[PDB]
Scaffold this active site. Structure first.
Site, PDB file in Angstrom:
ATOM      1  N   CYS B 107       0.839  -1.196   0.000  1.00 56.42           N
ATOM      2  CA  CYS B 107       0.000   0.000   0.000  1.00 56.42           C
ATOM      3  C   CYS B 107       0.877   1.250   0.000  1.00 56.42           C
ATOM      4  O   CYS B 107       1.585   1.518   0.976  1.00 56.42           O
ATOM      5  CB  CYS B 107      -0.943   0.032   1.204  1.00 56.42           C
ATOM      6  N   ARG B 110      -0.262   4.598   2.755  1.00 56.23           N
ATOM      7  CA  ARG B 110      -0.317   4.368   4.199  1.00 56.23           C
ATOM      8  C   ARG B 110      -0.028   5.606   5.041  1.00 56.23           C
ATOM      9  O   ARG B 110      -0.179   5.534   6.264  1.00 56.23           O
ATOM     10  CB  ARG B 110       0.658   3.254   4.580  1.00 56.23           C
ATOM     11  N   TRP B 279      -9.189   5.919  -1.703  1.00 64.04           N
ATOM     12  CA  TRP B 279      -9.403   6.574  -2.981  1.00 64.04           C
ATOM     13  C   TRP B 279      -8.312   6.084  -3.908  1.00 64.04           C
ATOM     14  O   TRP B 279      -7.368   5.420  -3.476  1.00 64.04           O
ATOM     15  CB  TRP B 279      -9.372   8.093  -2.869  1.00 64.04           C
ATOM     16  N   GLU B 284      -3.393   3.774 -11.113  1.00 69.01           N
ATOM     17  CA  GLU B 284      -4.183   2.550 -11.030  1.00 69.01           C
ATOM     18  C   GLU B 284      -5.207   2.508 -12.142  1.00 69.01           C
ATOM     19  O   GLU B 284      -5.446   1.458 -12.743  1.00 69.01           O
ATOM     20  CB  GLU B 284      -4.908   2.449  -9.684  1.00 69.01           C
TER      21      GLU B 284
HETATM   22  C1  HEM Z   1      -6.544   6.440   1.363  1.00 65.21           C
HETATM   23  C2  HEM Z   1      -6.032   6.336   0.130  1.00 65.21           C
HETATM   24  C3  HEM Z   1      -5.279   5.077  -0.381  1.00 65.21           C
HETATM   25  C4  HEM Z   1      -4.527   5.049  -1.489  1.00 65.21           C
HETATM   26  C5  HEM Z   1      -4.247   6.237  -2.441  1.00 65.21           C
HETATM   27  C6  HEM Z   1      -3.999   3.707  -1.646  1.00 65.21           C
HETATM   28  C7  HEM Z   1      -3.178   3.283  -2.666  1.00 65.21           C
HETATM   29  C8  HEM Z   1      -2.871   1.968  -2.911  1.00 65.21           C
HETATM   30  C9  HEM Z   1      -2.341   1.423  -4.137  1.00 65.21           C
HETATM   31  C10 HEM Z   1      -2.044   2.238  -5.399  1.00 65.21           C
HETATM   32  C11 HEM Z   1      -2.175   0.109  -3.975  1.00 65.21           C
HETATM   33  C12 HEM Z   1      -1.657  -0.873  -5.050  1.00 65.21           C
HETATM   34  C13 HEM Z   1      -2.898  -1.649  -5.490  1.00 65.21           C
HETATM   35  C14 HEM Z   1      -2.738  -2.238  -6.866  1.00 65.21           C
HETATM   36  O1  HEM Z   1      -1.803  -1.822  -7.594  1.00 65.21           O
HETATM   37  O2  HEM Z   1      -3.569  -3.106  -7.252  1.00 65.21           O
HETATM   38  C15 HEM Z   1      -2.596  -0.230  -2.620  1.00 65.21           C
HETATM   39  C16 HEM Z   1      -2.564  -1.472  -2.022  1.00 65.21           C
HETATM   40  C17 HEM Z   1      -3.144  -1.843  -0.822  1.00 65.21           C
HETATM   41  N1  HEM Z   1      -3.911  -1.048   0.029  1.00 65.21           N
HETATM   42 FE1  HEM Z   1      -3.887   1.043  -0.112  1.00 65.21          FE
HETATM   43  N2  HEM Z   1      -4.470   2.936  -0.602  1.00 65.21           N
HETATM   44  C18 HEM Z   1      -5.269   3.742   0.200  1.00 65.21           C
HETATM   45  C19 HEM Z   1      -5.941   3.325   1.338  1.00 65.21           C
HETATM   46  C20 HEM Z   1      -6.026   2.051   1.872  1.00 65.21           C
HETATM   47  C21 HEM Z   1      -6.893   1.619   2.961  1.00 65.21           C
HETATM   48  C22 HEM Z   1      -7.903   2.547   3.675  1.00 65.21           C
HETATM   49  C23 HEM Z   1      -6.660   0.309   3.184  1.00 65.21           C
HETATM   50  C24 HEM Z   1      -7.274  -0.652   4.228  1.00 65.21           C
HETATM   51  C25 HEM Z   1      -7.931  -0.228   5.318  1.00 65.21           C
HETATM   52  C26 HEM Z   1      -5.633  -0.126   2.250  1.00 65.21           C
HETATM   53  C27 HEM Z   1      -5.092  -1.397   2.157  1.00 65.21           C
HETATM   54  C28 HEM Z   1      -4.313  -1.827   1.096  1.00 65.21           C
HETATM   55  C29 HEM Z   1      -3.781  -3.157   0.897  1.00 65.21           C
HETATM   56  C30 HEM Z   1      -3.977  -4.349   1.839  1.00 65.21           C
HETATM   57  C31 HEM Z   1      -3.081  -3.162  -0.238  1.00 65.21           C
HETATM   58  C32 HEM Z   1      -2.348  -4.376  -0.822  1.00 65.21           C
HETATM   59  C33 HEM Z   1      -3.283  -5.017  -1.832  1.00 65.21           C
HETATM   60  C34 HEM Z   1      -2.643  -6.294  -2.302  1.00 65.21           C
HETATM   61  O3  HEM Z   1      -1.616  -6.727  -1.709  1.00 65.21           O
HETATM   62  O4  HEM Z   1      -3.174  -6.881  -3.266  1.00 65.21           O
HETATM   63  N3  HEM Z   1      -5.281   0.958   1.479  1.00 65.21           N
HETATM   64  N4  HEM Z   1      -3.007   0.934  -2.009  1.00 65.21           N
HETATM   65  N1  LIG Z   2      -7.127 -11.768  -8.329  1.00 63.48           N
HETATM   66  C1  LIG Z   2      -6.239 -12.075  -9.164  1.00 63.48           C
HETATM   67  N2  LIG Z   2      -5.103 -11.383  -9.232  1.00 63.48           N
HETATM   68  C2  LIG Z   2      -4.850 -10.309  -8.446  1.00 63.48           C
HETATM   69  C3  LIG Z   2      -4.184 -10.442  -7.222  1.00 63.48           C
HETATM   70  C4  LIG Z   2      -3.930  -9.316  -6.439  1.00 63.48           C
HETATM   71  C5  LIG Z   2      -4.356  -8.061  -6.880  1.00 63.48           C
HETATM   72  C6  LIG Z   2      -4.102  -6.816  -6.057  1.00 63.48           C
HETATM   73  C7  LIG Z   2      -5.071  -5.682  -6.393  1.00 63.48           C
HETATM   74  N3  LIG Z   2      -6.168  -5.585  -5.411  1.00 63.48           N
HETATM   75  C8  LIG Z   2      -7.105  -4.471  -5.733  1.00 63.48           C
HETATM   76  C9  LIG Z   2      -6.684  -3.236  -4.962  1.00 63.48           C
HETATM   77  C10 LIG Z   2      -6.039  -3.487  -3.771  1.00 63.48           C
HETATM   78  C11 LIG Z   2      -5.604  -2.446  -2.991  1.00 63.48           C
HETATM   79  C12 LIG Z   2      -5.805  -1.146  -3.410  1.00 63.48           C
HETATM   80  C13 LIG Z   2      -6.475  -0.852  -4.587  1.00 63.48           C
HETATM   81  N4  LIG Z   2      -6.628   0.454  -4.923  1.00 63.48           N
HETATM   82  C14 LIG Z   2      -6.872   1.415  -4.017  1.00 63.48           C
HETATM   83  N5  LIG Z   2      -6.480   2.609  -4.188  1.00 63.48           N
HETATM   84  C15 LIG Z   2      -7.644   1.084  -2.790  1.00 63.48           C
HETATM   85  N6  LIG Z   2      -8.534   0.111  -2.509  1.00 63.48           N
HETATM   86  C16 LIG Z   2      -8.998   0.170  -1.221  1.00 63.48           C
HETATM   87  C17 LIG Z   2      -8.472   1.179  -0.420  1.00 63.48           C
HETATM   88  S1  LIG Z   2      -7.356   2.065  -1.401  1.00 63.48           S
HETATM   89  C18 LIG Z   2      -6.922  -1.915  -5.389  1.00 63.48           C
HETATM   90  C19 LIG Z   2      -5.015  -7.935  -8.097  1.00 63.48           C
HETATM   91  C20 LIG Z   2      -5.264  -9.056  -8.880  1.00 63.48           C
HETATM   92  C21 LIG Z   2      -6.429 -13.236 -10.082  1.00 63.48           C
HETATM   93  N7  LIG Z   2      -6.633 -13.165 -11.420  1.00 63.48           N
HETATM   94  C22 LIG Z   2      -6.769 -14.379 -12.054  1.00 63.48           C
HETATM   95  C23 LIG Z   2      -6.678 -15.507 -11.240  1.00 63.48           C
HETATM   96  S2  LIG Z   2      -6.410 -14.905  -9.637  1.00 63.48           S
HETATM   97 CL   LIG Z   3      -8.660  -0.778  -9.344  1.00 65.40          CL
END
Ligand code: HEM
Ligand SMILES: N=C(Nc1ccc(CCNCc2cccc(NC(=N)c3nccs3)c2)cc1)c1nccs1
Ligand SMILES: [Cl-]
Ligand code: HEM
Ligand SMILES: N=C(Nc1ccc(CCNCc2cccc(NC(=N)c3nccs3)c2)cc1)c1nccs1
Ligand SMILES: C[C@H](O)[C@H](O)[C@H]1CNc2nc(N)[nH]c(=O)c2N1
Ligand SMILES: C[C@H](O)[C@H](O)[C@H]1CNc2nc(N)[nH]c(=O)c2N1
Ligand SMILES: [Ca+2]
Ligand SMILES: [Ca+2]
Ligand SMILES: [Cl-]
Ligand SMILES: [Gd]
Ligand SMILES: [Gd]
Ligand SMILES: [Zn+2]
Lengths: 403, 403
Positions: B107, B110, B279, B284
């Protein structure tokens, strides 16, 4: 073996080659240190590495288990017994240098790894002859802009005698003059070698693109200063295909990237001086060398010149100016007829390399953070490719600076 | 304690927090698997996780070992002895949700971790109530475009009972439809969930941006198909500030990234349904969602509209088109007054977060490959920042698809 996925295509491979990684990296189950720039920092050990290398050699020529293979193993064993070390055959040194390139995890250009001109300078005896070998390398590799990959291998490290060393990080580097304000005129990556050149009698310039002399170290000898003949150092003035003021920036870069401070390790032997050269990927010049804040740092000047709103990040002025600088680099090298590859073509060829290496060896050591280019990462196929990073030998290794 | 360097500034820190890493990642000294997307894939166990969390909690509120600390510990002991699980206090739940976000290595956002609205849905029963909790989440978090981070925590997993599960990966997703034309209309990432909604009674649209229904799963029931009221789903039509034809491409995206398929782990407890939202960072949408070859894959469309030379890579038509798509995203969200952050601002704030966390607890788990933006990598400060990746709890973890 680790499962390795391409997320653009869904295709899945297994890196069986990593199971053979000898030397250890910095990661543990507790924590990944993959992003670190420096990950890493006598008879029976040498034989193990030598035997393994000779095995690699005889596999590469499809003569594994042959009489020649066994005799050569015995021959290395006997030389190590008598002398504590051994000498590579010419053929082995050529194969070993190519393998070292092939094994380099941070090299995106490894599609080319079999096309490498190996200059054997293992009979070199003085800094003067070293300079001659280096000039021949530069002349060959530059090839008046039709760049050719080459490596010159100077004598191996051996007990009781100092190493050959090229103190410069590359054969062609621009002076970085530590200005008194803590600023730098020229390339800040080269402030130390620049001051060492001056320390050793070099009369400095005052430009931003002053080619440095070579500080060449023969065994047990202080470094000796050698000026590269200007006619051997091919440079490219930078201009932009449509921004005519760009040429007035007075920017240049050199044709030949020739890395001269890494250690080549083949079959347990170590070559501390083995400069190698290929050609540039344009992002090295256009993005890192010109736009890193701690390098030439021209991004804001270009953006202001392009009339971009540099007061707000969300205008993406940095992104737009960087693209045009990379355009200028590619346009300028093509106009000069100097070989260069853009990051899209390079990464596409690297994907073909990974596929070849899966077939040939069951995997390929690759450092994702270094393979993905510094701009447009996810626009290139390597971004979506999972990679396994590990250390094979023969290898190019970092080594301490000799001062 | 790993030494961690910033290569733009030269500053050094030591990550002492990685020593506390509870889980094991995929890396070994032999090989680094840090680039893998899926790094990860009884009462004495639950208790030891519960105890460590309770200690974390009371340490963070400066109640280190006090009378309340000892009583909370004995409470969870008796609960687990009575029932096989235990119930978090509302403040422990809030603390655990914030720390799970704080600990998320991938993330970049953070810096905001202390600001999170926790909706306690642990009394939920039936998918109907899930839908209401989710609608109140979407409404609160969207806030007419002034987006606010929020998490809704549904009942934890427990022995012999089913799980609450949100089958959708996000609360807002666009459908993906296939054909014997082969390709996908809509988002290819959502083809699986789209066929599932269709298989569960949803009648599909034929648009590129058909917002999907929700497939909500009460414990031990089939998933129930709920439609989001379209006035709850704030969307941004995409236009470009100067390229007037960009709007005619009909592109759009939604305001609220609300991730609904990750498992929240607090103190050995597991919340398989705990959607969280923040947000968007503009890349993204404008780089990954719209330009990935396996997503909307619009880059060539945009480049053709920009009259760029698409027949050679070295014109950098991919880079120029991507930049304008990201511009269109930023311009459209700002003009629609929907919260969005560009990748320069976000990475600059993450650098500040790194410094805050160095002071707060001696380090910060960070996944370099995911923190570095997918365009303009080295133009952002995180590129030059070495990072240590490790797993702390509380945590957000991937989990198998319900089906
Ligand atoms: C407040 C504005 C926030 C921004 C701009 C932001 C931005 C991002 C971005 C760009 C990613 C990469 C996701 C991707 O490329 O698919 C990410 C990952 C992540 N975010 Fe944040 N985030 C925010 C808030 C939060 C909040 C509120 C939470 C949970 C309470 C959170 C939990 C996570 C987690 C767990 C990941 C890892 C997702 C994964 O490993 O697949 N984020 N964030
Ligand atoms: N699920 C699959 N791959 C896969 C595995 C991991 C991921 C990680 C992406 N998580 C979506 C995501 C997670 C965290 C942040 C964002 N954005 C944001 N700003 C926020 N959200 C919430 C608060 S901030 C969006 C994406 C795809 C599979 N595809 C085919 C077979 S498995
Ligand atoms: Cl997305
Ligand atoms: C033929 C064209 C070549 C291209 C386009 C190319 C491209 C690159 C690039 C862009 C890097 C990363 C450099 C950096 O970011 O500092 C790299 C690294 C590297 N290259 Fe290649 N290369 C080529 C040929 C060669 C050759 C001929 C050798 C040796 C025989 C070689 C060995 C290496 C090694 C060892 C590294 C890693 C350096 C380090 O770890 O710091 N490359 N290459
Ligand atoms: N050494 C320091 N940092 C530092 C550490 C590592 C590096 C790696 C830079 N590799 C240069 C390089 C390497 C490989 C390829 C290229 N390019 C090319 N296309 C080719 N060349 C030759 C063949 S292809 C260029 C750079 C700087 C220190 N700074 C201060 C105190 S220590
Ligand atoms: C901290 C990080 O490892 C460092 O800045 C790396 C990232 N990836 C890189 N990739 C390449 N090709 N060259 C580099 O110098 C770097 N630098
Ligand atoms: C293979 C590679 O790990 C994968 O494509 C990663 C790279 N870095 C990423 N970074 C972010 N923010 N999001 C991602 O989905 C990915 N994907
Ligand atoms: Ca001999
Ligand atoms: Ca058909
Ligand atoms: Cl360089
Ligand atoms: Gd012009
Ligand atoms: Gd037109
Ligand atoms: Zn690792």
């Amino acid at each position: 073996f680790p499962r390795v996925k391409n997320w653009e295509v869904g295709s899945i491979t297994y890196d069986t080659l990593s199971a053979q990684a000898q030397q250890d990296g910095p990661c543990t189950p507790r924590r990944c240190l993959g992003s670190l720039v420096f990950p890493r920092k006598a008879p029976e050990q040498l034989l193990s590495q030598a035997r393994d290398f000779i095995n690699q050699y005889y596999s590469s020529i499809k003569r594994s288990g042959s009489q020649a293979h066994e005799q050569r193993l015995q021959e290395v064993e006997a030389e190590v017994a008598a002398t504590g070390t051994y000498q590579l055959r010419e053929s082995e040194l050529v194969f070993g240098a190519k393998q070292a390139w092939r094994n380099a995890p941070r090299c995106v250009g490894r599609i080319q790894w079999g096309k490498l001109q190996v200059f054997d300078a293992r009979d070199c005896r003085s800094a003067q002859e070293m300079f001659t070998y280096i000039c021949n390398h530069i002349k060959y590799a530059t090839n008046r802009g039709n760049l050719r990959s080459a490596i010159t291998v100077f004598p191996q490290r051996c007990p009781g005698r100092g190493d050959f060393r090229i103190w410069n990080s590359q054969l062609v580097r621009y002076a970085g003059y530590r200005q008194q304000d803590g600023s730098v005129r020229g390339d800040p990556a080269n402030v130390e070698i620049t001051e060492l050149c001056i320390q050793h009698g070099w009369t400095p310039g005052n430009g931003r693109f002053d080619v440095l002399p070579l500080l060449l170290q023969a065994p047990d000898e202080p470094p000796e200063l050698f000026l590269l003949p200007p006619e051997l150092v091919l440079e490219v003035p930078l201009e932009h295909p449509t921004l005519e003021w760009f040429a007035a920036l007075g920017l240049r870069w050199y044709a030949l990237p020739a890395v001269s401070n890494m250690l080549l390790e083949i079959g347990g032997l170590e070559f501390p001086a083995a400069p190698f050269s290929g050609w540039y990927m344009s992002t090295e010049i256009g993005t890192r060398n010109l736009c890193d804040p701690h390098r030439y740092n021209i991004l804001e000047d270009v953006a202001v010149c392009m009339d971009l709103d540099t007061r707000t990040t969300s205008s993406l002025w940095k992104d737009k100016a960087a693209v045009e600088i990379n355009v200028a680099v590619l346009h300028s090298y093509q106009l000069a007829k100097v070989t260069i590859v853009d990051h899209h073509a390079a990464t596409a060829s690297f994907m073909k390399h990974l596929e070849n290496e899966q077939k040939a060896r069951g995997g390929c050591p690759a450092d994702w953070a270094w393979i993905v280019p510094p701009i447009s990462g996810s626009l290139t196929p390597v971004f979506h490719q999972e990679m396994v990073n590990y250390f094979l030998s023969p290898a190019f290794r970092y080594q301490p600076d000799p001062w």
